[PDB]
Design an enzyme around this catalytic site. Structure first.
Site, PDB file in Angstrom:
ATOM      1  N   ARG A  17      -6.629   0.861   4.875  1.00  0.00           N
ATOM      2  CA  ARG A  17      -5.423   1.011   3.986  1.00  0.00           C
ATOM      3  C   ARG A  17      -4.671  -0.227   2.287  1.00  0.00           C
ATOM      4  NH1 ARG A  17      -2.260   1.156   8.803  1.00  0.00           N
ATOM      5  NH2 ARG A  17      -0.315   0.410   8.821  1.00  0.00           N
TER       6      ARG A  17
ATOM      7  N   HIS B  23       0.631  -1.190  -0.027  1.00  0.00           N
ATOM      8  CA  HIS B  23       0.208  -0.098  -0.059  1.00  0.00           C
ATOM      9  C   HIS B  23       1.149   1.363   0.081  1.00  0.00           C
ATOM     10  CE1 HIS B  23       0.879   1.396   4.054  1.00  0.00           C
ATOM     11  NE2 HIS B  23       0.814   0.712   4.843  1.00  0.00           N
TER      12      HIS B  23
ATOM     13  N   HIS C  78       0.628  -5.196   3.249  1.00  0.00           N
ATOM     14  CA  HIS C  78       2.206  -3.818   4.252  1.00  0.00           C
ATOM     15  C   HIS C  78       3.279  -4.341   4.152  1.00  0.00           C
ATOM     16  CE1 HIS C  78      -2.145  -2.525   5.940  1.00  0.00           C
ATOM     17  NE2 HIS C  78      -1.906  -3.739   6.278  1.00  0.00           N
TER      18      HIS C  78
ATOM     19  N   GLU D  82       0.091  -4.741   9.212  1.00  0.00           N
ATOM     20  CA  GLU D  82       1.315  -4.244   9.334  1.00  0.00           C
ATOM     21  C   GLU D  82       1.707  -4.595  11.266  1.00  0.00           C
ATOM     22  OE1 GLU D  82       3.694  -1.985   7.587  1.00  0.00           O
ATOM     23  OE2 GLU D  82       4.636  -3.109   9.465  1.00  0.00           O
TER      24      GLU D  82
HETATM   25  S1  LIG Z   1       7.144   1.392  10.049  1.00  0.00           S
HETATM   26  O1  LIG Z   1       6.957  -0.443   8.512  1.00  0.00           O
HETATM   27  O2  LIG Z   1       5.275   0.329   9.412  1.00  0.00           O
HETATM   28  C1  LIG Z   1       7.549   2.033  10.038  1.00  0.00           C
HETATM   29  C2  LIG Z   1       6.450   3.602  10.423  1.00  0.00           C
HETATM   30  C3  LIG Z   1       6.822   4.569  10.458  1.00  0.00           C
HETATM   31  C4  LIG Z   1       8.963   4.947  10.471  1.00  0.00           C
HETATM   32  C5  LIG Z   1       9.419   4.397  10.110  1.00  0.00           C
HETATM   33  S2  LIG Z   1      11.506   3.962   9.120  1.00  0.00           S
HETATM   34  O3  LIG Z   1      11.265   4.786   8.620  1.00  0.00           O
HETATM   35  O4  LIG Z   1      11.739   2.918   9.464  1.00  0.00           O
HETATM   36  N1  LIG Z   1      12.057   5.107  10.986  1.00  0.00           N
HETATM   37  C6  LIG Z   1      11.993   4.649  12.150  1.00  0.00           C
HETATM   38  C7  LIG Z   1      11.225   3.754  12.458  1.00  0.00           C
HETATM   39  C8  LIG Z   1      11.622   3.213  14.094  1.00  0.00           C
HETATM   40  C9  LIG Z   1      10.825   2.052  14.647  1.00  0.00           C
HETATM   41  C10 LIG Z   1      10.725   0.855  14.073  1.00  0.00           C
HETATM   42  C11 LIG Z   1      11.041  -0.321  15.276  1.00  0.00           C
HETATM   43  C12 LIG Z   1      10.478   0.410  16.294  1.00  0.00           C
HETATM   44  C13 LIG Z   1      10.367   1.879  15.929  1.00  0.00           C
HETATM   45  C14 LIG Z   1      11.871   4.098  14.821  1.00  0.00           C
HETATM   46  C15 LIG Z   1      12.377   5.405  14.600  1.00  0.00           C
HETATM   47  C16 LIG Z   1      12.710   5.254  13.488  1.00  0.00           C
HETATM   48  C17 LIG Z   1      13.290   7.062  12.808  1.00  0.00           C
HETATM   49  O5  LIG Z   1      13.188   6.953  11.347  1.00  0.00           O
HETATM   50  N2  LIG Z   1      13.177   7.967  13.097  1.00  0.00           N
HETATM   51  C18 LIG Z   1      14.204   9.078  12.680  1.00  0.00           C
HETATM   52  C19 LIG Z   1       8.771   2.469   9.536  1.00  0.00           C
END
Ligand SMILES: *S(=O)(=O)c1cccc(S(=O)(=O)Nc2cc(C3=CCCC3)ccc2C(=O)NC)c1
Ligand SMILES: *S(=O)(=O)c1cccc(S(=O)(=O)Nc2cc(C3=CCCC3)ccc2C(=O)NC)c1
Ligand SMILES: [Cl-]
Lengths: 246, 236
Positions: B60, B9, B184, B87
């Site tokens: 989604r 998605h 997802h 997800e």
């Molecule tokens: S998941 O794949 O659905 C997801 C959701 C939002 C952001 C991200 S990211 O691109 O991988 N960045 C990110 C991830 C995480 C965590 C993943 C496991 C638990 C916490 C924490 C911080 C970040 C980040 O980029 N902060 C600036 C994936």
């Protein structure tokens, strides 16, 4: 007590040309889609919830179901499609408008096919312009030769819809599942005739409003505690019901 | 030989707010819907036909599937929804944006959670804003108590997704049904990991593009005969 909800899709793109659709897979018009939206929002305002959904293999009904599920935030529900809930098959009349139908087949045959419960329209033959489009569509590949209609009376339509009701929907109802059925006028007429014990004459005179949720309260033996009720603003229901009677 | 199509998605409304959605049922943004429309157009131009579709219980992904089926005129296909394609459940981080997560949990833990294959985020506790929204959603009512996560590592997500793949999707493929899967990134990762035998490191390195049909060609052992391929104009 069980509760069942039916909904009949609204206007299609071929309704705007006044041509018979039947099994031809015409899509909703803007108005038909609005009707689906309004019905879904009526279900949402009343807090209706479902556990499983049944529709045909035809997109005007399927898209009506989709719009309803969107409106009530229940897109995650299981959906089941069956050809047995399709619109009545209009045979060789498919694709023709009313003037064309009159020219080709006569006032007398048109009157007979209109007013009759069990006289089918002419068969859709391999030279029909929509034969390959419909009869050779792969979504019917698993139908047996005896199941694939070339044309249908209302009686044929009801006779192929009611087995799906009996064998697939009834057990879900008895499994206390809240069922939503998004289909077409003539297959829904099959369900209504069976539930309410109506005659051929009454059921042929019964037109179901489009886009208005139809609510059944059923007792333990699946008998309607009362005849079909209509969900919506009481003034717009009476108006649709006056439209339909007219 | 066997042809399998996956699609991830697109952009969600919580992507726009940089908020962890996880099991929160965020809808597609308008851009994400447009992505699904282009992926569907790609399949239609390629003439792809399917026999059965699987997706998650999250809207989604479901709306991505609906858009694709509309685009390829296959709205009549049977569709199966399962929570096992959901997800990753982001537990306590659900609903937090990046700043809020940093302030609440610290750079160190955020780094670990972002980097780890098997370390889950904090559990979603009863006082969490979205606790009732998700954990009391009736779409999970049939899940045993030990199935409903309060949080998931990537490992957890893959462990609960692959049983659906093995018990339901693999039989369909061996039956000769042409399968479409709309889910997802993280649940698709488990399918890709298993299909290709990737390591934990390699699967964490793999980021699947969004809104793009991903095509696998599988032999009689359901092993890919070549790397995954993408459908669409050469730009995309
Ligand atoms: S998941 O794949 O659905 C997801 C959701 C939002 C952001 C991200 S990211 O691109 O991988 N960045 C990110 C991830 C995480 C965590 C993943 C496991 C638990 C916490 C924490 C911080 C970040 C980040 O980029 N902060 C600036 C994936
Ligand atoms: S059917 O219910 O899906 C249907 C489609 C288009 C028009 C009509 S009608 O309102 O009943 N008028 C109509 C129907 C028919 C036939 C019904 C059975 C086969 C043919 C013939 C003529 C007419 C008509 O009123 N022409 C002006 C129903
Ligand atoms: Cl669906």
């Amino acid at each position: 007590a069980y509760k069942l909800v039916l909904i009949r899709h609204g206007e299609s793109a071929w309704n705007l040309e006044n041509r018979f659709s039947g099994w031809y897979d015409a899509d909703l018009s803007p108005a038909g889609h609005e009707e689906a939206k309004r019905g879904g929002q009526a279900l949402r305002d009343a807090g209706y919830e479902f556990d499983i959904c049944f529709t045909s293999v035809q997109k005007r009904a399927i898209r009506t179901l989709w719009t309803v599920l969107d409106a009530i935030d229940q897109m995650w529900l299981p959906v089941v499609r069956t050809w047995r809930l399709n619109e009545r098959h209009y045979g060789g009349l498919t694709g023709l408008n009313k003037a064309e139908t009159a020219a080709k087949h006569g006032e007398a045959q048109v009157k007979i096919w209109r007013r009759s419960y069990d006289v089918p329209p002419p068969p859709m033959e391999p030279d029909h312009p929509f034969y390959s489009n419909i009869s050779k569509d792969r979504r019917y590949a698993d139908l047996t030769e005896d199941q694939l209609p070339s044309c249908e009376s209302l009686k044929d339509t009801i006779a192929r819809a009611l087995p799906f009701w009996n064998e697939e929907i009834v057990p879900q109802i008895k499994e206390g599942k809240r069922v939503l059925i998004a289909a077409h006028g003539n297959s829904l007429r099959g369900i209504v005739k069976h539930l309410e014990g109506l005659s051929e004459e009454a059921i042929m005179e019964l037109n179901l409003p489009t886009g208005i949720p139809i609510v059944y309260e059923l007792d333990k033996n699946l008998k309607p505690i009362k005849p079909m009720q209509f969900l919506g603003d009481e003034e717009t229901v009476r108006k649709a019901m006056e439209a339909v009677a007219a």
